[PDB]
């Protein structure tokens, strides 16, 4: 288990809801759109499929609640652009989702208390067309074409991310006004403090300390996290004590070259004439229509056919090649 | 110990061509030849590969009550900046004690993405192309396949017959001096050279191989000042040139190339390019030839055409009556170039008749048929076909 | 071969075993941070994070 060392964290999010910035427990790190099929590899601050006790459980996800990690339901997790996305794979900091045409991306969840936490980032999502036909549903039988996707396999063996020790977590609840002096309650934690008064103003303490002749607003206290690991996030500050001390962990769902099945458009009704070919097209979805001459001057012409259209094409002595969507190219030659 | 027959056929795939072999003193022989595939493989030289770039940004070094210092690192597109008078905030309040004397160090570099192993475009330099052909020959009543280089030097012996294909009449290639390959698509592109890539365009990130250690980068990476009370590394950068090329590339050589060229990859090649002609030399052995005396003599020949349609295919039927000296095999060939006969060899015996299929474009076709060593005149009145356009060459 | 302060040890067999993170959580992460550039890093990460 790799999740015993790593922990979920709180990071910056530009839109937590209504266009307001917050320290989100579901903050977006990196969105990968390298897959040609349309599958997105989303990176978040929380961990999915792991409980607070580090044990694996697909029905649960762990998020950072104020200062301590807490458990949340998997069913509450949602991904959306302009309309809700179809979830395909979830393990650790990573999410696999098939999204429709959108301008932004939102990743949300529901915690222990029924309160919705979401993070919105401006991401232009418009996956390219595989083949020559703009279809909606995936077919069981069709033309086999090369495409790339992030494999739904939970095992991590190829790709990796950088991990380091978390920075000093600031906490104002550590300091209290004891009559007219500052009282720092350690509570079994290594606390790093600094005061705007004389004497023992700063240092790294493991026990309770009392700052004489000082006010609560004049002091700053922080909890040190040296026992756990955290992703090298640009949304989280670097640890002040350690230099370039880093570690690395293998990440699930790597990119691999696969095969995408595409449907072939129905053959149009064809009629012939003197060095001319007439095709009565009937598309069910947007279909690419391309043609070229089989001689010295090819003169390539292409058009995306949307609905019922009649096409008049010229057939020279050298020949004419016509390609209707994902179908094999039709070849035409004149008689005599 | 044989006879060398030299003939020239047009460089067109899927058309059966007939050739008459006439060795002096020996009975004629008819051979049917069909080009199955003509492959033009260019000699490649990889310059570089391009893929999606990865902007590696570590956690920003926030120095409370002090100044941070940027060090020059030997990294591609390495950017470093120290911002003064910062006051960032975390979940439980401010991160720094001071208010005006805090600094933030922002650093970022550009390298190859994880996808570069799978998703990449290769920039090749095409040299002298190699020609090769797959030919089907109907020799002695059996179909034989000959695969040889179309250079007029590579000899392939199939059933004791030596075959020499080429040299090609046209040295034409659909590929230019500089080509770009993506999966199964080839593009004729004048790509930028190594170390001369521009931001937001093809070649913004350059590397020798998809697994290479060093990488060239020019993406115009500029680091920006972070937002008030926010820990983040904002930056201005030109988007992926490879990602922009994937939607702006247009049609590949498979759809744009002249002469009806079919483009394939692994290795890159031009398949079935209908350009020029192809010379074929066949060294037929002694055993295959039969003497005119040992061959049946054909006398009292007459021809009748009961059905004909002038089309690209064999739309004509001809019945030839004959009187033979003995039983044996005779070669059938058309002496008129406007008419072509489907049959190459038929069995001849006594006072009998033969049926032949023929193709012509003429309305009134007057052609001579040579059965063995004797000729017969055929009178054909062929009618127009059903369709003006056909789906076969 | 993995490193630890001044001694060389085989990556798959660390001295902290059994349960490296459970005994000392800070000492285990510091050990992995020094072996990040080593070729047998993932052999050490698999051994140190198994109980
Ligand atoms: C030699 O090969 C040719 C071409 O493949 C064969 O010719 C025909 O084969 C089938 C017969 O019904 C048809 O499906 C084809 O359309 C036809 N092709 C042509 C060009 O005529 C031929 O039979 C073979 N002969 C031997 C002896 O192997
Ligand atoms: C397919 O992916 C594998 C693994 O990433 C790589 O080794 C291979 O070169 C890729 N091939 C193509 C044609 O993209």
Q: What is the CATH number of domain B1-43+128-175+257-293?
A: 2.60.98.10
Query: What is the least distance, in Å, from the CA of A168 to any CA of chain C?
Result: 15
Task: Return the number of other C-beta atoms located less than 10 Å from residue B47's C-beta.
Answer: 16
Answer yes or no: are the C-beta atoms of A259 and A164 closer than 8 Å. no
A219: its two tokens: 């002091």
Quickly tell me which residue has 């979920």 as its tokens: A8
* CA dist., res. B327 & res. B346, Å (int): 11
Chain breaks in chain C (C to N over 2.5 A) after: none
The structural domains of chain C, ordered by start, are 1-51 (1.10.287.2230)
For this PDB entry, the determination method is X-ray
Give the residue carrying structure tokens 């030399």. B281
Q: How far apart are CA A9 and CA A25, in angstroms?
A: 6
The DSSP bridge partners found for residue A230 are A164
The CA-based angle B278-B284-B287, given to 5 degrees, is: 165
- Confirm or reject contact between A201 and chain B (CB < 8 A): no
Residue C49 in contact with residue C20, Cβ under 8 Å? yes
| Cα(A229)–Cα(A239) distance, integer angstroms | 12
Rounded Cα gap, residues A238 and A217, in angstroms: 25
Q: How far apart are CA A123 and CA A31, in angstroms?
A: 8
**Helices C41-48 and C25-34, interaxial angle, to 10°?**
170
- Candidates B240, B260, B271, B386, partner chain A, best to mutate (most A CBs within 10 A): B260
Pocket probe for ligand 1: among B18, B37, B138, B359, the residue whose CB has the most ligand atoms within 8 Å is B138
Cα–Cα distance, B369 to B339 (Å, whole number): 10
Quote the distance between the C-alpha of residue A296 and its chain's center.
48
Mutate to test the pocket of ligand 1, among B143, B145, B346, B391 (most ligand atoms within 8 A of CB): B143
Per DSSP, the three-state class of B265 is: coil
Residues in chain C within 8 Å Cβ distance of A5: 21, 25, 28-29, 49
Two tokens at C38? 């080593």
d(CA A120, CA A107): 7
The per-residue b/e assignment along B112-136, b for 16 or more CB within 10 angstroms, e otherwise, is bbbbbbbbbbbbbebeebebbbbbe
Domain annotation for chain A: domains and CATH numbers:
1-168+224-262 (2.60.40.3200), 169-223 (2.60.40.4310), 263-336 (2.60.40.2400)
Which of B229, B232, B314 should we substitute to test contact with A (largest number of A Cβ atoms within 10 Å)? B232
Q: Which residues from A are below 8 Å from C50, CB to CB?
A: 1
| Alpha-carbon distances of A4 from A166, B304, C15, rounded to whole Å | 15, 94, 19
C-alpha of residue B117 to centroid of ligand 2, in Å: 6
Decide if A227 and C26 are in contact by the 8 Å CB cutoff: yes
**Cis, peptide link before residue B99, omega less than 30° from 0:** no
> Where exactly are the structural domains of chain B?
1-43+128-175+257-293, 44-127+176-256, 294-393
- The alpha-carbon radius of gyration of chain C (Å, integer) is 10
CB burial class (10 A; 0-12, 13-18, 19+) of residue B31?
Answer: buried
**Six-digit token string for B298:** 């054909």
Closest C-alpha to B46, from B211, B166, B276: B211
Counted across chains A and B, CB pairs separated by less than 8 A come out at 162
Q: Say if residue B286 is exposed, middle or buried (CB neighbours under 10 Å; 0-12, 13-18, 19+).
A: exposed
**From the CA of B53, how far away is ligand 2's center (Å)?**
17
- Rounded distance, CA B233 to CA B105, Å? 9
CB contact under 8 A, C25 and A5: yes
Q: B55: helix, coil or strand?
A: strand
Please tell me which of the candidates A23, A196, A334 has its beta carbon nearest to residue B389. A334
8-state DSSP, A307: S
Is A272 near chain B, with CB under 8 Å?
A: yes
Q: Which strand ranges, in their side-by-side order, compose the sheet holding A105-110? A: A78-80, A105-110, A116-121
- Residues of C within 8 A of A247 (CB-CB) are 29, 32-33, 36
Nearest to B288 by CA among B98, B84, B126, B141: B141
Exposed (0-12), middle (13-18) or buried (19+): which is B332, by Cβ within 10 Å?
buried
Report the candidate in A2, A6, A4 with the shortest Cα–Cα distance to residue A233: A6
H/E stretch holding A89: strand A86-98
Nearest to A5 by CA among A226, A156, A222, A236: A226
- C-alpha–C-alpha distance, residues A113 and A50, integer Å: 19
Tokens 């006439």 locate to B22
Supply φ then ψ for residue C30, to 5 degrees. -70, -35
Å from CA of B84 to ligand 1 middle: 84
State this model's resolution in angstroms. 2.6
Instruction: Give distance in angstroms: CA of B366 to centre of ligand 1.
Output: 27
- Spatial distance between the Cα atoms of A299 and A293, rounded to a whole number of angstroms: 7
Contact B255 A290 (CB under 8 A): yes
Using a CB–CB cutoff of 8 Å, tell me whether B264 touches chain A.
no
Spatial distance between the Cα atoms of B372 and B330, rounded to a whole number of angstroms: 5
Rounded-to-5 percentages of helix, strand, coil across chain C: 45, 10, 45
Minimal CA separation from C33 to chain A, in Å: 5
Q: How far apart are CA A99 and CA A45, in angstroms?
A: 20
| CA A2 to each of CA A47, A259, C13: distance values in angstroms, whole numbers, following the listed order | 12, 32, 17
Other CB atoms within 10 Å distance of the CB of residue A319: 20
User: For residue B211, with 0-12 CB atoms within 10 Å meaning exposed, 13-18 middle and 19 or more buried, which class applies?
Assistant: exposed
Q: Is A236 on the interface with B (CB under 8 A)?
A: yes
Tokens matching residue B90:
């975390």
**Cβ–Cβ < 8 Å for A258, A39:** no
- B149 - beta bridge partners? B132
Whether residue A148 lies within 8 A of chain B, CB to CB, comes out as yes
- C49 and A5 within 8 Å at the Cβ level: the answer is yes
Inter-chain touch A333–B390, beta carbons under 8 Å: yes
Element (H, E) at B110: strand B103-112
- Judge: B97–A232 Cβ closer than 8 Å, yes or no: no
Tokens at B108, concatenated: 């970022």
Query: Hey, is A14 helix, strand or coil?
Result: coil
Give the three-state DSSP class for B70: coil
Sign for the pseudo-dihedral over CA of A150, A156, A161, A164? positive
CA distance A276 to B298: 47
Ramachandran quadrant class, B148 (left: phi over 0; alpha: psi -120 to 50; beta: rest):
beta
Q: Give the pocket of ligand 1 (CB within 6 Å).
A: B 16, 138, 141-143
N- to C-terminal Cα separation, chain C: 22
Q: What six digits make up the tokens of A144?
A: 């086999």
Give the strand pairing for B222-223 and A56-65: unpaired
Residues A197 and A195: their CA atoms lie apart, in Å, by 5
Helix (H, G, I), strand (E, B) or coil at A13: strand
Ligand 2 atom closest to the CA of A255, numbered from 1: 5
Residue of B5, B18, B8 lying closest to B277 (CA atoms)? B8
The helix or strand, by DSSP H or E, that contains position A36, with its residue range, turns out to be none
Contacts of A291 (CB under 8 A, 6+ apart): A300, A301, A313, A320, A321, A322, A323
Q: How far does the CA of residue C12 sit from the closest CA of chain A (Å)? A: 15
Looking at the DSSP bridge assignments, the partners of residue A304 are: A288
Domain range B294-393, CATH class: mainly beta
CA of B244 to the centre of ligand 2 (A): 21
Cβ atoms within 10 Å of B161's Cβ, excluding its own: 20
Q: Of the candidates B236, B362, B374, B241, which has an alpha carbon nearest to the alpha carbon of residue B305?
A: B362
Counting every residue written for chain C, the total comes to 51
Which distant-in-sequence residues (6+ apart) come within 8 Å of A79 by Cβ?
A42, A85, A87, A95, A97, A99, A105, A106, A107
Residue in B267, B254, B253 with CA at minimum distance from that of residue B41: B267
Q: Say yes or no: A225 contacts chain B, CB-CB below 8 A.
A: no
Whether residue B266 lies within 8 A of chain A, CB to CB, comes out as no
Provide the token pair at C5.
């302060």
**Nearest residue on chain A to C50, judged by CA atoms?**
A1
Q: Among A302, A283, A282, which Cα is nearest to A292's?
A: A302
Query: CB-based contact (8 Å) between A56 and chain C?
Result: no
Nearest Cα residue to A92 out of A178, A17, A170, A2: A2
CA of B138 to the centre of ligand 1 (A): 10
* CA-closest candidate to residue B62, choices B82, B92, B46, B42: B82
Task: Give how far Cα A12 sits from Cα of A24, A47, A327, Å.
Answer: 6, 17, 49
CA-CA distance, B390 to B15, in Å (whole number)?
Answer: 14
Query: Hey, is A192 helix, strand or coil?
Result: strand
Q: Which atom of ligand 2 is nearest to the CA of B266?
A: 13
Contact call for residues A210 and A186 (beta carbons, < 8 A): no
Q: Which residues of B touch A277 (CB under 8 A)?
A: 389
The pair of structure tokens assigned to B387 is 């369709």
Peptide bond into A162 cis (omega under 30): no
Structure tokens at A122: 């401006």
- B contact residues 130-169, partner A, Cβ 8 Å cutoff: none
Kindly list the partner chains of chain C, i.e. chains with 3 or more CB atom pairs below 8 Å: A
Token pair 């640009």 in the structure block, residue? A234
Side-chain half-sphere of B217: how many Cα atoms within 13 Å? 27
Q: Are A45 and A9 in contact (CB under 8 A)?
A: yes
- Helix spans in B172-323 (H): 241-248, 253-256
Task: From A34, A35, A151, A257, give the residue whose CB has the most ligand 2 atoms within 8 Å, as the site to mutate.
Answer: A257
CB contact under 8 A, B256 and A298: yes
What is the Cα C8 distance to its own chain's centre?
Answer: 11
Q: Give the closest-approach CA distance of C36 to chain A in angstroms.
A: 6
Residues with CB under 6 A from ligand 2: A 256-257; B 117-118
> Residue B41 contacts by C-beta under 8 Å, 6 or more apart in sequence?
B129, B130, B132, B267, B268, B269, B270
Structure tokens given for B257:
């190339």
């Amino acid at each position: 288990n790799v999740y015993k060392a790593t922990r979920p964290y709180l990071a910056h999010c530009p839109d937590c809801g209504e266009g307001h910035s917050c320290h989100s427990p579901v903050a977006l790190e990196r969105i990968r759109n390298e897959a040609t099929d349309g599958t997105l590899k989303i990176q978040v601050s929380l961990q999915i499929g792991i409980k607070t006790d580090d044990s694996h459980d697909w029905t649960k996800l762990r998020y950072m609640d104020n200062h301590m990690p807490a458990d949340a339901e998997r069913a509450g997790l949602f991904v959306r652009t302009s309309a809700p996305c179809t979830i395909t794979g979830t393990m650790g900091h990573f999410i696999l989702a098939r999204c429709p045409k959108g301008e932004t991306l939102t990743v949300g969840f529901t915690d222990s208390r029924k309160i919705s936490h979401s993070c919105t980032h401006p991401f232009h999502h418009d996956p390219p067309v595989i083949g020559r036909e703009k279809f909606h549903s995936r077919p069981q039988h069709g033309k086999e074409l090369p495409c790339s996707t992030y494999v739904q396999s939970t095992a991590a063996t190829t790709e990796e991310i950088e991990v380091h020790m978390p920075p000093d977590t600031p906490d104002r609840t550590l300091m209290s006004q004891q009559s007219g002096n500052v009282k720092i309650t350690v509570n079994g934690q290594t606390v790093r403090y600094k005061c705007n008064c004389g004497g023992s103003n700063e240092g790294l303490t493991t026990t309770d300390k009392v700052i004489n002749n000082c006010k609560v607003d004049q002091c700053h206290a922080a909890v040190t996290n040296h026992k756990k690991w955290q992703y090298n996030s640009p949304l989280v500050p670097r640890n002040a004590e350690l230099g370039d001390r880093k570690g690395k962990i293998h990440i699930p769902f790597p990119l691999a070259n696969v095969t995408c099945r595409v449907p072939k458009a129905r053959n149009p009704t064809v009629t012939y004439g003197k060095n001319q070919v007439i095709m009565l097209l009937y598309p069910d979805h947007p279909t690419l229509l391309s043609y070229r001459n089989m001689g010295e001057e090819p003169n390539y012409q292409e058009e995306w056919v949307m609905h019922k259209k009649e096409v008049v094409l010229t057939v020279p002595t050298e020949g004419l090649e016509v390609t209707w969507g994902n179908n094999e190219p039709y070849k035409y030659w004149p008689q005599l | 110990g044989g006879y060398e027959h030299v003939t020239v056929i047009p460089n067109t795939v899927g058309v059966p061509y007939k050739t008459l072999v006439n060795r002096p003193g020996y009975s004629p022989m008819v051979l049917e030849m069909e080009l199955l595939s003509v492959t033009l493989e260019p000699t490649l030289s990889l310059d570089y590969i391009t893929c999606e770039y990865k902007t590696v940004i570590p956690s920003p070094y926030v120095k409370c009550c002090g100044t941070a210092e940027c060090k020059d690192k030997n990294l591609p597109d390495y950017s470093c900046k120290v911002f003064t008078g910062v006051y960032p905030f975390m979940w439980g309040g401010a991160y720094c004690f001071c208010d005006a004397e805090n600094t933030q160090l922002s650093e970022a570099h550009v390298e190859k993405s994880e996808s570069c192993k799978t998703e990449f475009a290769s920039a090749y330099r095409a040299h002298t192309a190699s020609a090769s052909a797959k030919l089907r020959v109907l020799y002695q009543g059996n179909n034989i396949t000959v695969t040889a280089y179309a250079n007029g030097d590579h000899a392939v012996t199939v059933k004791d017959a030596k075959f020499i294909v080429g040299p090609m009449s046209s040295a034409w290639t659909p590929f230019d001096n500089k080509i770009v390959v993506y999966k199964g698509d080839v593009y004729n592109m004048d790509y930028p050279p190594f170390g001369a890539g521009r931001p937001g365009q093809f070649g913004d990130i350059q590397s020798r191989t998809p697994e290479s250690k060093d990488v060239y980068a020019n993406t115009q990476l500029v680091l920006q000042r972070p937002a008030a009370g926010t820990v983040h590394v904002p930056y201005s950068q030109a988007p992926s040139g490879f990602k922009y090329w994937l939607k702006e590339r247009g049609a590949s050589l498979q759809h744009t190339a002249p002469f009806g060229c079919q483009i394939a990859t692994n290795p890159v090649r031009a398949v079935n390019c209908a350009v020029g002609n192809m010379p074929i030399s066949i060294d037929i052995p002694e055993a295959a030839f039969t003497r005119v005396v040992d061959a049946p003599s054909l006398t009292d020949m007459s021809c009748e055409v009961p059905a004909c349609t002038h089309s690209s295919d064999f739309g004509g039927v001809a019945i030839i009556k004959y009187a033979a000296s003995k039983k044996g095999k005779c070669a059938v060939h058309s002496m008129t170039n406007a008419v072509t006969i489907r049959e190459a060899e038929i069995e001849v015996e006594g006072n009998s008749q033969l049926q032949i299929s023929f193709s012509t474009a003429l309305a009134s076709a007057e052609f001579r048929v040579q059965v063995c060593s004797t000729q017969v005149h055929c009178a054909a009145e062929c009618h127009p076909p059903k369709d003006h356009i056909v789906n076969y060459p | 071969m993995c490193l630890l302060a001044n001694t060389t040890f085989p990556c798959s067999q660390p001295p902290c075993t059994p349960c490296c993170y459970e005994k000392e959580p800070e000492e285990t992460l510091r050990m992995l941070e020094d072996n990040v550039m080593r070729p047998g890093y993932y052999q050490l990460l698999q051994a140190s994070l198994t109980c």
